[PDB]
Design a protein around this ligand. Sequence first.
Ligand code: Y8G
Length: 163
Amino acid sequence: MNIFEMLRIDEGLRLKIYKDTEGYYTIGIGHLLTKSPSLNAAKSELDKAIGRNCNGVITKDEAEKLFNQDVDAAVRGILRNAKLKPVYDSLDAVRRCAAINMVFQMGETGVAGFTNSLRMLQQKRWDEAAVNLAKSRWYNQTPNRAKRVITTFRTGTWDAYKN
Ligand SMILES: CCCCc1cccs1
């Protein structure tokens, strides 16, 4: 397992515009298009992202390329962030995947309230971090996915994804 396989499991693959768990237009492997309620706005974002007139539909190759760009953007966002980078660099490779997963799902802004969780992770207080991570809108709104990510932080194994 690696970050691509992990997020492919968590996000699925859909080749036509769909709505994410928050109701926002999305495509591919969890690629957010827009928070606007306008499907036309989402279609414009899609065409800009792919470089052709897509009519709301992409190929698997295009979905996988967007996904690679999105994973890389999450990593670079962590590495450019003075609060996230030191914690990320303190983690082992499996837990770094859990970190990328959260930033992919919520962005840097969405993880801003996780200050106490970040401290517990940097301190390697895994059980305490797991308890703290679950006290979140994130966990309450997407509990099965959050449980998998939290188990990855708690154990440093892929057990939640193999199971
Ligand atoms: C709990 C904060 C979101 C995930 C992480 C980013 C960097 C280290 S952990």
